[PDB]
């Protein structure tokens, strides 16, 4: 009829790929995040902000390449190409670490476009939208570690760089400054992740193992009609199996796949809440009781009071080359030595 009708005819015409009303967001706003990450890992140095030569052009490998965060003096600016820090001078913008703020803040909309594309195909093909609500959890994770954590903590410099050997620096950064280990929200997170990795292997090694009998040869992959009104695995038999070995066992394969949906997103949301609490520097650092008892009684020495005395050894050694904008050079007497280990 009118406008917004032929534009709905097309964008919903079917081809090999599927561009849609939010594919019009997803395909342009992403793919430049991929190009910018590849460009920063291949061509672009980090000599000026950090002090680290981290490009393919400067001898680094696939493990040790990273699009690096800007310096601390670029406190919380958005770091546009044009504007008050680069003025459109593209070479100086790439030198000042604007590529990280390009890729992160540009793919934050890529996640939104992808979840809306996932939400739009589920309306096109008339299905229930449970595939959409699961992908909200890695969006929560991405926002929590790349977006909310550098905002309230004096710099984009204190953010995990887009790399492989830089994520490791970020992990040891939390392990030696924040003690992210003792966070109960992180306990929730590892329980969700590792239990989902459990239950995947359980279900996969159960379903095709209590399988029915349809074919002739021992290759049981060739005996499945995709247009089938029967089953392909004996629910009664697997129930009796796991009931007699393990005790409690499922009986409702609605609830089974819903539980597989529910575990890792619960883990990742309950990790995102703790990453927020760490962004505000409400860290799960030392307690009251064992510390006031160990200051009094010398020979106490729990693994707790060894982890604290080890994290101090992390934080006093790595900082003087991790963050040069502090401008501190420790003398060797100040460092935690350990009496000639």
């Amino acid at each position: 009829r009118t406008w917004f009708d032929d534009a709905d005819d097309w964008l919903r015409q079917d081809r090999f790929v599927f561009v849609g009303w939010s594919g019009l967001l997803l395909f342009p706003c992403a793919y430049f995040a991929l190009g910018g990450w590849l460009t920063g890992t291949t061509f672009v140095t980090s000599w000026y902000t950090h002090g680290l030569a981290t490009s393919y052009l400067e001898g680094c490998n696939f493990l040790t390449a990273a699009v690096s965060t800007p310096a601390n003096s670029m406190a919380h600016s958005l770091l546009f190409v044009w504007g008050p820090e680069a003025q459109g001078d593209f070479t100086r913008w790439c030198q000042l670490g604007g590529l990280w703020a390009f890729v992160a803040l540009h793919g934050a909309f890529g996640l939104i476009g992808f979840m809306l594309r996932q939400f739009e195909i589920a309306r096109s093909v008339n299905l229930r939208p449970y595939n959409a609500i699961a992908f909200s959890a890695p969006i929560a994770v991405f926002v929590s570690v790349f977006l909310i954590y550098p905002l309230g903590q004096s710099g984009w410099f204190f953010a995990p760089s887009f790399g492989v050997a830089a994520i490791f620096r970020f992990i040891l950064f939390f392990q030696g400054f924040h003690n992210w280990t003792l966070n109960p929200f992180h306990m929730m997170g590892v329980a969700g992740v590792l239990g989902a990795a459990l239950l995947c292997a359980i279900h996969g090694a159960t379903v095709e193992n209590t399988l029915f009998e349809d074919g002739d040869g021992a290759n049981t992959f060739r005996a499945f009609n995709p247009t089938q009104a029967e089953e392909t695995y004996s629910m009664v038999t697997a129930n009796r199996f796991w009931s007699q070995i393990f005790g409690v066992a499922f009986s409702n394969k609605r609830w089974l796949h819903f539980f597989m949906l529910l575990v890792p997103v619960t883990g990742l949301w309950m990790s995102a809440i703790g990453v927020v609490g760490l962004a505000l520097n409400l860290r799960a650092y030392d307690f009251v009781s064992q510390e006031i008892r160990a200051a009094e009684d010398p020979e106490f020495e729990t693994f707790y009071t060894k982890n604290i005395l080890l994290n101090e050894g992390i934080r006093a050694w790595m900082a003087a080359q991790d963050q040069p904008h502090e401008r501190l050079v420790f003398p060797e007497e100040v460092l935690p030595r350990g009496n000639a280990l």
Binding site: R123, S136, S144
Partner: peptide
């Protein structure tokens, strides 16, 4: 205040995504 109002903000994000899904998908609820 900041802790409560970023945690509850992030939870209301998920509550909004859930009700935005469940509003549109009423016939196939």
């Amino acid at each position: 205040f900041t802790f409560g109002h970023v945690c509850f903000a992030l939870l209301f994000f998920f509550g909004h995504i859930w009700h935005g899904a469940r509003t549109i998908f009423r016939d196939v609820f």
